[PDB]
Amino acid sequence: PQITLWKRPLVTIKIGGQLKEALLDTGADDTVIEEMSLPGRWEPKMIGGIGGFIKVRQYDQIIIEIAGHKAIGTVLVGPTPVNIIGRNLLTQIGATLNF
Amino acid sequence: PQITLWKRPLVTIKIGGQLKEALLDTGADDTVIEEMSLPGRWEPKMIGGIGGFIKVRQYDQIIIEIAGHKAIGTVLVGPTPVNIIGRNLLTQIGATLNF
Numbered sequence: 001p002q003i004t005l006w007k008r009p010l011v012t013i014k015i016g017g018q019l020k021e022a023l024l025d026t027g028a029d030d031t032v033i034e035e036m037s038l039p040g041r042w043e044p045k046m047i048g049g050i051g052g053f054i055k056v057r058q059y060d061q062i063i064i065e066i067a068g069h070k071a072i073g074t075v076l077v078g079p080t081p082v083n084i085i086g087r088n089l090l091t092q093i094g095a096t097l098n099f
Numbered sequence: 100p101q102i103t104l105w106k107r108p109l110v111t112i113k114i115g116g117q118l119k120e121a122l123l124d125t126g127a128d129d130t131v132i133e134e135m136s137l138p139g140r141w142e143p144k145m146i147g148g149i150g151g152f153i154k155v156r157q158y159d160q161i162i163i164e165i166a167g168h169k170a171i172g173t174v175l176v177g178p179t180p181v182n183i184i185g186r187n188l189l190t191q192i193g194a195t196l197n198f
């Protein structure tokens with residue numbers, strides 16, 4: 001897929017058997033998903049963004065399918081206004097920005 | 100160019116008469132620049148992201164050259180942690196997201 005940017009780049013993902021919508025974000029180092037139950041151990045972390053810092057639960061080596069492509073890596077879960085797929089996962093599906 | 104996502108995608112931009120380094124942010128609807136005295140009128144605006152909102156000043160019709168690509172649109176100036184080139188300007192340089 002060659003995704004143009006006139007609209008927000010929304011993609012369907014499947015995490016924990018659950019389908020959700022997420023924004024492919026090249027300005028995010030990591031991947032933060034809204035509060036949900038995820039099987040596994042998780043370590044408490046803090047990340048920051050434009051408005052400041054938020055507390056998240058950190059899950060390692062989670063299997064996640066982004067637009068059909070699979071990836072296995074870290075997923076942070078917490079109070080984000082929107083689900084974001086960061087660079088840690090976008091590199092796994094071989095996404096690049098072009099112009 | 101084709102930008103890979105192993106590292107933050109940073110490019111040099113030109114606003115007003117100065118050179119800067121900005122991050123191409125596919126998950127930013129808007130463009131927000133670090134604090135700087137740009138001549139011209141503006142309106143107060145509130146912008147949010149992860150963690151909350153920040154107050155910014157809004158300038159319209161500003162010309163920015165990004166990666167040797169001139170565009171023109173609204174720029175928001177405020178105490179942002181990084182210069183962020185959003186979709187309002189990315190669509191003007193014809194940038195796509197491909198995986």
Ligand SMILES: CCCC[C@H](NC(=O)[C@H](C)NC(=O)[C@H](CCC(=O)O)NC(=O)[C@H](Cc1ccccc1)NC[C@H](CC(C)C)NC(=O)[C@@H](NC(=O)[C@@H](N)CCCNC(N)=[NH2+])C(C)C)C(N)=O
Nearest residue numbers: 027028029030046047048049050081126127128129147148
């Ligand atoms: C391996 C870990 C690395 C270290 C780790 N990294 C970070 O914290 C880095 C700097 N932060 C990030 O990468 C975070 C996302 C979270 C994350 O990836 O962890 N990135 C971000 O927050 C980037 C911008 C940025 C980049 C780098 C630094 C700071 C800021 N923006 C992400 C964000 C996504 C959006 C859909 C909410 N976009 C925005 O914030 C833009 N906002 C918008 O476009 C709004 N119009 C959206 C709606 C707002 N309102 C609402 N939802 N009710 C803004 C630039 C105008 C850490 N914790 O220190």
